[model samples]
Target: TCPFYKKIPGTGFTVDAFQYGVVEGCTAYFLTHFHSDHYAGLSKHFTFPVYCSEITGNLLKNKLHVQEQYIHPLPLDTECIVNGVKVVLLDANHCPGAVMILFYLPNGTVILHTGDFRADPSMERSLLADQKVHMLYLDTTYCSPEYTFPSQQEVIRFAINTAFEAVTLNPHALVVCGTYSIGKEKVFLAIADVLGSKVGMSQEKYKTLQCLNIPEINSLITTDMCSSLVHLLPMMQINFKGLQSHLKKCGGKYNQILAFRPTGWTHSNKFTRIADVIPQTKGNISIYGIPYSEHSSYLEMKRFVQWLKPQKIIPTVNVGTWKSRSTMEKYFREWKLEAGY
Candidate 1:
């Protein structure tokens, strides 16, 4: 049977056995990040030898419920051999447990798969050690110039100020903002940084966050540490009405509630669905919109491509159609000539 293969640009080889088939071969699989796109198909199809960063392995064991027996964990800045292939794990600063994979073949072919990274200098330094990359399975999600995102600091500041302003406006209401468990921690940190109190975290989230060891921000306050100022409520417990009930039960002492999600509410109108069921107030609850994304913006993506200067750049994860691929190819040829094969 001819292996169903598609070329992954930077690798100089086609990925024969993808999520589609369970082929019998000594294939080495490298997972860059644990985002749904990157690891979405891992459980369905198992590779003979799978390689991923230590953080990724922990997340897989914790989040995805994958058995530890299946994973071959490699530490950062270290190269290891799996199934006769050399693999290196590099940090991808997009999320807490994100990684980039460098596959070095014996035939002088080097493939760099950047699994959703940002243009942060710290991240760049982590991947820059091996300058000679041939084929780059790049994260060209925002290749178009129209895509522009605010810096992490700016997003954090906005989330902080907006939550505080909402609290000040309605001293007796609940404020809830939803964000992802990982990236949303930044929003919580921003709130804590502003209020001079530690934010609350779920038991599971707290455990995972502890392993990351981000010094600038503190961990979720324990149940013992829950104070009058900041309380960490699990996502399931706090709906719009439940929040109002809590406030009313508190004798209207708590008027504002702030919540965040990785992906729960996207539009302002979404508040109404919950409002229909809950006791409605005149903008008593405010949902602040913050543009804190893990992926790099278009400009940053372009810059990263330029810096790597890979022989062939293949856009993955977010590249939907042939038109999108063509558009990215055009831009790669024009602005990122150094990235071309």
Candidate 2:
């Protein structure tokens, strides 16, 4: 059994374990991203220096009001020494400001903490491909074969084309995009760009985007609800009753509501083809559960392990459950053996 998994062995650093209430012997804290679950217990009462990417640092300062003195935003792909350990940040490819951590201990051991990432081919070109990693802290969100959803590009294209068809049939339709606080910007941004549609969202969310400082995204967004046909809202409001109530509140601003809820949880084994992934419709309200995941598929995870050939892999997510962890351990061992390690 694993013990003190969050703490890198023989180091005084903790990765994404703020919720456990200030891990003992923790000299410094490393945050992977600004996701709620990851930063759950991080509050104003900080004790140690917290290292994160610049964008995440911005959110921490503005949103959480964490003191400026304790925040350190390290540049990507550049090495910084903390507690005499060389640390590097890699693009996580999950949300804006998210990063995969690389640690080079003084003892000549290399470790990677891939904090919630969508594995892609470009990873082979990343610095990790060359380095011999001793341990890999992986994001195993979709670690089963049945959970292989469409790639981000494919899903975005599908959503755009589907929305185009819907709007072509009804120009007065309103496209509702479900989003997290920081992730899924590509889907909505692409839809707005391709369709030449403006975007609408709440003031706080709008402020959050401004913090991101992407000019094109800033240009597409408006705080006024009536100014745009496409609206970016939290996932909770993308449901049938929620959409209906939102429509009523709008007072006939748009004729129909086409909502997209993009997440891997929506992926179905019955979907043989992209077109087979259907949407739920009910009298001018339709909800599409898009399999647009920020996490790696089972095949991608296996291939990544095969390529990295780390001496050990630690599952970062979904490790609390015994059954799930055991299943993942089996897969990891199989992949390690397949890699001839």
Candidate 3:
């Protein structure tokens, strides 16, 4: 989604707009998830009432230090009214606590705002799955045909297998899985469990994971450096120099570093097949850019648009320029036409 675009057009509610500051017509604020890019400007100093999923609410309170009084955690799949408008929150399947908001305006207009999501068949079970939306605010992060990352499960499996292989092949290599504060918990968690290694991260990050309340995560956490072969580092620190410095800090316990950098940017149209995009190695350091993305693939987004058949589509991302907007609209129009509308 566009970080700069905060207010949803023609609505009293502002979504992910903390950076924009006091919107004139906004009566309430909505946060889709706990990601830094989305919750850019939110802070303890903010005064507006915020609406989000319960999981996101906890993250806001514990991580961002946002006040509890100003945060409203909406229950999933339950219809609730705010300012005469009926709203419902659906699991986004992107990150833990992320949601796609459904707003039913008083004038009989229905808007579906997908904060950031990975479209799957399970979404067909939702209440609005069969209904037509008047306006659809879409997550267009991967709106083009170039992005065709594999499904979450497929990518996770690749990571776990690759990690296991990396360690077995090079007995002295330490496997470091790159991550953000919130996303891709499954990749590292699975690797740790499968390899029987403790997941290492900062104490501050441990506090954030506690908010997720995943029982398996509690068993495999460690703050002690070099205590575990499998460690979690921020995505930004997975570079060649970073790995070299990190390996030096391990005190001779490990001689090589095998890092997994999971993101959509790594996968693109250039790769003919997923298997073609293999791990890259430089001396003693090897980094794998696994296509384990939280956002939907271009194909998935196309399918979602066709199936949902929204009367009007307003992209939430990559619309800053006329060229980008036109590109997105071209794909959107094709998908809408395929839906026979």
Candidate 4:
């Protein structure tokens, strides 16, 4: 009823963050990832039986303030039954705990919920290829032609190389990166590993990182800001105004600030083209916009849809009306033919 909640007609269950339990009266609950946008109003409600990855469940309990008893751990690539409905979890390559839910109903209908995922190679030939998806709940982010980019590894490499070069060239500069609270740890970790320095995060992200349990990066919340050459700050803190005054303090000694934003939206055709690394500089601040996307590109989404061949195609975002439906209909043409519903 609100914010991407779906019902299977015969089944009594719903997924994503449903703040109201008794009002909807669903069977079970599922949280795909720890993104704030994906879990709208989740911190307030926890009455239903919530199923998520072990990490997401921890974030739901510890960070989001959900009670422990209501949370259920669903490991990826495993089958489990709750409320007489068969469910399987698969890895969604978006973030640490993100998962793709495969639901097998009693009526022989299969539903797949791909919650904010990039099409990973591990999933291409897994059990997914063997099974026919009945209803496909797709993540429609970056479903447009303009949103195209290189692989995540390539982008991560691009980010690390670019950041390394910027900091090296400007010895009196601090490399500041814009990342999410939970999602883009890999980029920062790579930077730290390559540059041999610890990354500084804010208090908010520090708390979030504790629950995420991502390994190998020396992440500090309240450490010496001067000690860290690279600041792994959240995306919101990438603006020059905030860094301008503080960074100017390190002028002559550490004057310049190089910020890197690793996301697909940076490569909009209006400015950067496909597989382009564009960095703009103003005063002492330079920003490198890399094409690092967590969600599938338009081509990747089309490929996944072609392979799965679901019986009924239901996009996960903004597909409520005919005009919106008409736009979504052109996404993957073979969906209707293969699903045949």
Candidate 5:
């Protein structure tokens, strides 16, 4: 039954089948990460035992709030057996719980599936050392040179310095940033590392940081820290509007309000209107736009593809196809199957 599975629709497979069916009684399945694109389809149809990294499992349990009986948690660099398949989770530093999966099938076929990954030095070195990757399903998200970004440390430093500069310009200001719960924690930590004071975080962010056990950073805050410097707030009292209204009721005394949005809200018309309203009511408000993305850049993706030498690179998330896919196909077409879609 090798290579006999019905191809999933919309995958260029000339078949009426809606999903891929591999092996008549295959009882194991692997999930590389908890990202919506990777695991969202698990519950819809597939019901076999699913393996993922422990952090991914925690994210699924605590973040997504899912409680599937078949979810199995595996640690990074550890191997596990599922239906005779040797499965291992590799580091994929795109996000907190992201992982690349290596499947050693019983038929001696080795498959490496990179679920959303970045060209972090550690990840690249780990993947490059593996010389026996037979069939690799890779990430080709940032395949164009136009999609460039600064290094992670540079972006983090920029955000920290910007926040500090805003505070220095106006000492009596509350700097509020809109970031994903997990990511904001890191940004706050970076700020604390440089400023020697914990940046104010909403209660939701505090809870998320706690769930991830970031207490060493939390301990750096002083008891009498200014409202602008405290990292914890009451539950049900989060969100920008509530914070602005509360500050206004307190006489809008803060000299400046610095809010960091993960996405480019300042570039949007609707958010511009909201930003306009903020300064009008709550003293002076400055919303900084910093392009700090967790995804890899085009060159990083190309280098990663070259390292893996995958037969096919399927990029999930973002848009556009990988530029290196064609070159890779041409280079490897003679040796093995190389396809991209």
Candidate 6:
């Protein structure tokens, strides 16, 4: 039911991001992040003045080639009026430049669009402060009680310790970390820092990291595949075929490549709790799934809603049960689970 060009009933001539359709008609446009799904239909010809962070603006100009003039870099926590709508950007805590949008309508109704975020300490101190949010568009990707997960810190510690143990078992082995194209840079940085090793990435991955240069992430880059013990790549690279291919490059014993995926959806009643090392899986690559997620779990979502006290809840993304994962089926199959509560 959430359309990109959806103009609110009483709002002035304005619109949200230019996804799902063209941007020619909207007077003002806002982008939450550089995630492709968030800007699925965006293009170079997107002429409307799009609001985003400086980091996202650079990505748009360099990655998508969107003209610089059409991009307006909005500072976080600063309220600016455009098209008669007071807009404020909050740190989404999803990725480096991702932001949650807050709109102060002329009618005294404030709408919050949490693009995709985790409820953490920074939010409790900032965005969750005294704000009367009337409507909330939530990124309820894991809005179910079964999805209670540990904080990002714990998850990172778990992953770091897992890598340490894996290496102890075989010092010659390469610790393979699975990450998204853009997100999870912090996880790799953490691993590299704790281990005093560089995260090996392909040419493009290095370029991506170079552009988003936050000094803290320097634990990565400045190294080749042969020199590094940890090989960090995209999450999709956590498969047998991909690991086997990388394994060839490493050329060690059969147990050299250890792959692990960090995600909160790994939270399941089937598993007792979210921990560091995964139970052994039957596979060539000793793969593990850690409960590392930027999205708020069910408990976190509920607490955030209570704090915001929105009149209506709008889910930005749909959570469907996967045929492959039985643990997630309980909440996904019962759509009414959210309704009765």
Give me the candidate number with maximum lDDT.
2
Tens digit of lDDT per residue, candidate 2, span 1-341? 11466789878998887778757788898999999988988777776799999999998888888899999989998878898888889998888899999999878999999988988778889887667999999899888877766677888889889998888888889999987768888888888776777788998888888767576665788898787888988888888889988888777868799999876655374455666778899899999888777788888888877888888888887888999999999888787777789
**Across residues 2-51, which tens digit of lDDT does each residue of candidate 6 receive?**
45324544554333456545534556667788887777667788777888
Candidate 2 has which clashing residue pairs, if any? none
- Candidate 3's TM-score reads 0.93
Residue 303 displacement (Å), model 2: 0.7
- Using TM-score as the yardstick, the better of models 3 and 4 is 3
Please state every model's RMSD to the true fold in angstroms.
6.2, 1.9, 2.3, 2.8, 7.8, 4.9
Which stretch of 10 consecutive residues in model 4 shows the poorest summed lDDT? 216-225
| Ranking of models by TM-score | 2, 3, 4, 6, 1, 5
What does candidate 5's lDDT look like per residue over 116-204, in tens digits? 66676566566447666666655655545456655667667777777677667766766655553344346556766665565555454
Once fitted onto the true fold, the runs of candidate 3 whose alpha carbons sit more than 4 angstroms away are 1-11, 267-269
User: For candidate 5, what is the lDDT?
Assistant: 0.54
Best by TM-score: 2
lDDT of 6 at 341: 31
Q: What is the lDDT of candidate 4?
A: 0.74
RMSD of 6: 4.9
List clash counts for every candidate, in order. Answer: 26, 0, 0, 0, 3, 0
Off by over 4 Å in 4: 3-5, 20-23, 217-222, 248-253, 270-276, 320-322, 334-341
Instruction: Rate residue 49 of model 5 by lDDT.
Output: 59
Please provide, for model 4 over 85-202, each residue's C-alpha lDDT reduced to its tens digit, 9 standing for 90 to 100: 8888898888889998888889888888898899865677776877788788888877677766777787777777777787787666788878765776777778877877877766
Query: What is the Cα-based TM-score of model 5?
Result: 0.69
lDDT tens string, model 3, 1-341?
32434555556887877776677878899999898878988988878889998889888898888898999988999999976678899999888999999988777778889998888777878987657788888999988887776777777777778888878888788988887668788888888888887888888888888888677666778788577888888889999988888888878899888888877655353564556666778998888877777888888888877778788888888877999999998887788777787
Candidate 1 C-alpha error for residue 23, in Å: 4.1
